[PDB]
Structure 1
């Protein structure tokens, strides 16, 4: 079926939970043996969210190459994304090592450091220009260059230096700051505006490594971001845009990382975002 009328048909019939459970039943199951090794317990935020072995990002290190991060490669859309958990106190150096080694231009953050009164990720970037951060375990230096605070999101320019080679690179940090503590946003308008700002920066384009996107677990809000982006790109590429099947795209992405889209409300919100976004594109 088309999207917008499939949408109204699920609303009127109140069957979002059944649709979402079907997706959960059909989703791929691949091994995640490296994630579960005992030496990696303090590298995982949640015991039930792990990268598959076949698509995990490897650190260029011979001691321990493990990080909780996955490469999502979308062949028809010609887009790639790295989805990862919010960094932990003992993985902030690994996080920036990955950004460096994978040649990423942008980092997309969809959570606040504290939500619901608890810490959802480490304070992994510097908050003042004159107070830079050094990650001694991976030999990187990170400096805040500039910060632009808007009503729904903040953009930061960061400098990452590889202290071993003295090479430097400019990284863009796109921080969506207004996702509510409970539920999903009422309108997708500010989320779509944010997606378009990431796109306009070059951070999603083939001349760079894959964008790094995270929330707390790296599957829920993060899944909504890449699912909406890929669906809108396919609607632009194909002769028949109504042939884009959001459930099929989501199942394809779940071949690369488990659990993408965590609730039936996130599923409904993803439909809403793609529907509204397709009108603005034209």
Structure 2
């Protein structure tokens, strides 16, 4: 079926939970043996969210190459994404090592450091220009260059230096700051505006390594971001945009990381975002 009318048909019939459970039943199951090794327990935020072995990002280190991060490679859309958990106190250095080694331009953050009165990820970037951060375990230096605070999101320019080679690179930090503590946003308008700002920066384009996207677990809000982006790109590429099947795209993405889209409300919100986003692209 088309999307917008499949949408109204699920609303009128109140069957979002049944649709979402079908997706969960059909989703791929692949091994994640490296994630479950005992030496990696303090590298995982949640015991039930792990990268598959076949698609995990490897750190360029011979001691321990493990990070909770997956490469989502979308062949028809010609986009790649790295989805990862929010960094932990003992993985902030690994996180920036990955950004460096994978040649990423942008980092997309969809959570606040504290939500619901608890810490959802480490304070992993500097908050003042004159107070830079040094990660001694991976030999990297990170400096805040500039910060632009808007009503729904903040964009930061950061300098990452490989202290071993003295090479430097500019990294863009795109921080969506207004996702509600419970539920999903009422309108997708500010999320779409944010997605378009990431796009306009070059961070999603083939001349750079894959964008790094995270929330707390790296599957829920993060899944919504890449699902909406890929679906809108396919609607632009194809002769028949109504042929884009969001459930099929989501199942393809779940071949590369488990659990993408965590609730039926997140599924409905993803439909809403793609539907509204397709009108703004045109032709309008």
Secondary structure (helix, strand or coil) at the match of 2:96 reads helix
CA drift of 1:214 comes to 0.0
Provide TM-score, normalisation by structure 2: 0.99
CA drift of 1:262 comes to 0.0
d(CA) in 1 for partners of 2:88 and 2:55? Answer: 21
Secondary structure (helix, strand or coil) at the match of 2:23 reads helix
CA drift of 1:163 comes to 0.0
CA drift of 1:270 comes to 0.0
Secondary structure (helix, strand or coil) at the match of 1:21 reads helix
The alignment's C-alpha RMSD in Å is 0.0
Superposed CA offset, 1:20-51 (max 9, x none): 00000000000000000000000000000000
d(CA) in 2 for partners of 1:192 and 1:97? Answer: 29
Secondary structure (helix, strand or coil) at the match of 2:234 reads helix
Provide TM-score, normalisation by structure 1: 1.00
CA drift of 1:59 comes to 0.1
d(CA) in 2 for partners of 1:30 and 1:169? Answer: 35
Superposed CA offset, 1:128-167 (max 9, x none): 0000000000000000000000000000000000000000
Superposed CA offset, 1:231-253 (max 9, x none): 00000000000000000000000
CA drift of 1:13 comes to 0.0
Secondary structure (helix, strand or coil) at the match of 1:129 reads coil
d(CA) in 2 for partners of 1:122 and 1:103? Answer: 22
Total equivalences in the alignment: 282
CA drift of 1:101 comes to 0.0
CA drift of 1:274 comes to 0.0
1:270 is matched with which residue?
270
d(CA) in 2 for partners of 1:279 and 1:71? Answer: 30
d(CA) in 2 for partners of 1:70 and 1:15? Answer: 31
Superposed CA offset, 1:176-213 (max 9, x none): 00000000000000000000000000000000000000
d(CA) in 2 for partners of 1:271 and 1:153? Answer: 22
Q: Structure 2: any 5+ residue segments left out of the alignment? A: none
Secondary structure (helix, strand or coil) at the match of 2:51 reads coil
Counterpart check, 1:221 vs 2:225:
no
CA drift of 1:258 comes to 0.0
d(CA) in 1 for partners of 2:198 and 2:41? Answer: 33
CA drift of 1:271 comes to 0.0
d(CA) in 2 for partners of 1:120 and 1:40? Answer: 19
Q: Structure 1: any 5+ residue segments left out of the alignment? A: none
d(CA) in 1 for partners of 2:33 and 2:158? Answer: 34
d(CA) in 2 for partners of 1:275 and 1:241? Answer: 11
Shift >2 Å, 4+ stretches: none
Secondary structure (helix, strand or coil) at the match of 1:63 reads coil
